């Protein structure tokens, strides 16, 4: 049953599952920051069980679907989740991470402090986005990869992230198959 | 102040702030608290003035001035976590994306669009219909031109920005060539 | 005697000394953003006299020690101070400065808007970190130095900072020797 800090600001209609932590001063389900839609809330937010949202996190209502946070996610101070974002399971957003509209973040991705993701981007499984990395609209974000810089570029594979997941070269090759066949 | 402004009850608005009609102030905004200037803090000799039609969506901070009211123009849109320092002047129809940071005395002209997490050095001027890209760092020396796109750390011009007319553009260009 | 805005959210246990300003909507002493510890608070936060925290600043409780803010610091809107950070005296954090876990910031350092400091880094005396600078784990920060960019690189010596401080040549040699040993 959700532990919602009294100072958290939760819009009518937001779905918060059991075993969700919502910390002080979060703003959840307020209108999408889309000038065609604001201040209407056509959709809301859905936060799934085991997710911890520590404080001052903003997660906007969707325009075409519920903004979605998967199981066992960890969102740290001042993170910004725009309208229609879909976050998978076991995702970490560090402090002041910024996800633009319609961004998808896949299973186990780790987004470092103050990284910034262009609207409509896709961060694939077990990616590590470095502090302050700027993911521009056309960048191809490969699974299991580390991205750094302005603009963001691949510097290697996320070995650290792979180990912790405890996942085989089978379930990894499979994720590559999903990435490769995505178009 | 006797108008249809909608202010979320969690917004923290200093006494003396001027809020015009059709304004939206979202949750946990902090408006009109003392300028972050060690020579003045915690005094509030000036305040903040938000003009009609401006939407400030949540978690936005706009500090009171040191030498003038901090000033937000008509029909602006300020998104989550934006920071507006003392003595900033924003013109009409400006967009600040999430976590945009405007240093002290920054001026932002008509129609400027500032992308997520860009940072503008104190005393800079962002000219008419400029596009500042996400995460761009605008340093003190950069000479911003009207209608231009800036990206990067540090910020550099990369282009001109995509229904004003040639007579209106010439009048802007005129203001710029004299300053 | 600490002046604490009614909207500031202060965890049970937080130590706030006299002549401290805590502005609107600060979150101080909430659990460390460490998945091994959260939501436990094994330690807290200690803010020392003279410090001004202007608004919307987050300072998390420690995992291995009290998160510590020294005397006469100035922390501006939206600054993020992670678990186990130790900030010395007369430090300035501009708006949206991010200090990762266990970061140490020494005497008179000045961190510019939205700069980002990797966990376990050390920012030495009277350093200037420029707006948006990304301090990565391998950067050997040196006292009195100016760092800018993504990633951060040394660009010069913080003469403005040294001059303001009024620190003489004797004091600078002691800091320089403290660095040469550690
Ligand atoms: C991206 C990251 C994982 C890389 O760490 P690493 O693999 O140990 O990398 P290194 O520090 O050895 O640096 C490797 C190279 O990448 C660069 N680099 C590393 N992190 C960078 C970053 N965030 N931005 C830009 N460049 C970066 C280094 O400058 C170096 O460049 P070089 O090849 O010219 O020497 C790390 O720097 C990072 O950003 N982690 C996130 C920290 C964070 O968000 N902490 C919050 C915890 S809650
Ligand atoms: C600045 C911006 C408008 C440029 O758009 P664009 O011209 O379509 O840019 P593209 O991604 O097609 O590529 C332009 C070039 O500049 C680079 N670039 C674009 N935006 C950049 C940014 N923010 N930082 C760094 N480099 C950037 C690209 O890498 C590319 O470099 P290259 O051509 O040398 O390979 C856009 O990228 C941007 O930053 N928009 C902000 C997004 C935002 O804030 N959304 C929130 C909505 S509320
Ligand atoms: C870092 C800083 C102190 C350097 O200022 P400065 O010494 O006057 O430097 P200049 O503006 O003369 O620029 C020198 C070089 O550094 C670069 N530079 C300066 N600041 C930079 C920054 N923040 N990021 C990247 N590059 C930067 C310039 O591009 C220039 O490069 P070039 O030699 O290739 O042309 C300043 O730019 C800064 O970032 N200050 C922090 C601002 C702030 O947070 N204010 C809030 C007030 S509370
Ligand atoms: C906390 C506080 O008082 N802040 C105010 C104050 O900032 P400021 O201390 O940076 O002084 P400035 O004279 O602008 O610095 C000039 C240059 O030197 C750089 N600078 C500064 C300090 C330092 O130690 N090192 C350094 O390199 C600096 O980065 C810059 O590039 O003055 C700003 C201003 O009037 O525009 C206000 O917007 C601020 N609210
Ligand atoms: C969410 C959480 O628990 N956070 C805490 C935790 O961080 P952390 O999970 O990043 O582990 P670390 O041992 O610092 O990673 C080492 C390096 O690998 C990088 N790293 C990390 C994960 C990944 O998948 N890939 C990767 O490259 C990583 O970016 C870094 O460059 O531990 C930190 C700490 O002990 O000081 C705390 O400050 C944090 N608040
Ligand atoms: Na609040």
TrEMBL record, chain A:
GO process annotations (BP): lipid biosynthetic process
The organism's place on the tree of life at top rank: Bacteria
GO molecular function, one term: acyl-[acyl-carrier-protein]-UDP-N-acetylglucosamine O-acyltransferase activity
Keyword terms of this UniProt record: Acyltransferase, Transferase
InterPro entries to which the protein is assigned, alphabetical: Hexapep, Lipid_A_LpxA, Trimer_LpxA-like_sf
Residues holding CoA 2: 76, 113, 131, 137
Pfam family, one: Hexapep
Keyword Acyltransferase set for record: yes
PANTHER family for this protein: ACYL-[ACYL-CARRIER-PROTEIN]--UDP-N-ACETYLGLUCOSAMINE O-ACYLTRANSFERASE, ACYL-[ACYL-CARRIER-PROTEIN]--UDP-N-ACETYLGLUCOSAMINE O-ACYLTRANSFERASE, MITOCHONDRIAL-RELATED
Annotated protein name in UniProt: UDP-N-acetylglucosamine acyltransferase
Organism from which the protein derives: Psychrobacter cryohalolentis (strain ATCC BAA-1226 / DSM 17306 / VKM B-2378 / K5)
UniProtKB/TrEMBL annotation, chain B:
Keyword field: Acyltransferase, Transferase
Pfam families listed in its UniProt record: Hexapep (PF00132)
Record's keyword annotation contains Acyltransferase: yes
Binding site for CoA 2: 79, 116, 134, 140
InterPro entries: Hexapep, Lipid_A_LpxA, Trimer_LpxA-like_sf
An example molecular function term from Gene Ontology annotations: acyl-[acyl-carrier-protein]-UDP-N-acetylglucosamine O-acyltransferase activity
Binding annotation for CoA 1: 79, 116, 134, 140-141
Single Gene Ontology BP annotation: lipid biosynthetic process
Keyword hit for Transferase: yes
PANTHER family documented for this protein: ACYL-[ACYL-CARRIER-PROTEIN]--UDP-N-ACETYLGLUCOSAMINE O-ACYLTRANSFERASE, ACYL-[ACYL-CARRIER-PROTEIN]--UDP-N-ACETYLGLUCOSAMINE O-ACYLTRANSFERASE, MITOCHONDRIAL-RELATED
Protein name, entry field: UDP-N-acetylglucosamine acyltransferase
């Amino acid at each position: 049953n959700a532990q919602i800090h009294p100072s958290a600001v939760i819009h009518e209609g937001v779905i918060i599952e059991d075993d969700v932590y919502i910390g002080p001063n979060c703003i959840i389900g307020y209108p999408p920051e889309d000038k065609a839609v604001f201040p209407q809330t056509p959709y809301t937010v859905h936060i799934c069980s085991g997710t911890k949202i520590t404080g001052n996190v903003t997660i906007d209502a969707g325009t075409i679907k519920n903004t979605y946070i998967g199981n066992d996610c960890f969102l740290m101070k001042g993170a910004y989740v725009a309208h229609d974002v879909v976050i998978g399971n076991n995702v970490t957003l560090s402090s002041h991470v910024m996800l633009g509209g319609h961004v998808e973040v896949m299973e186990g991705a780790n987004l470092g402090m103050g990284c910034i993701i262009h609207q409509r981007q896709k961060i694939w499984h077990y990616c590590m986005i470095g502090m302050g990395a700027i993911v521009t609209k056309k960048l191809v974000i490969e699974p299991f990869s580390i991205y750094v810089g302005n603009p963001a570029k691949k510097i290697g594979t996320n070995d650290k992230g792979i180990e912790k997941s405890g996942i085989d070269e089978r379930a990894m090759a499979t994720i590559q198959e999903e990435f490769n066949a995505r178009r």
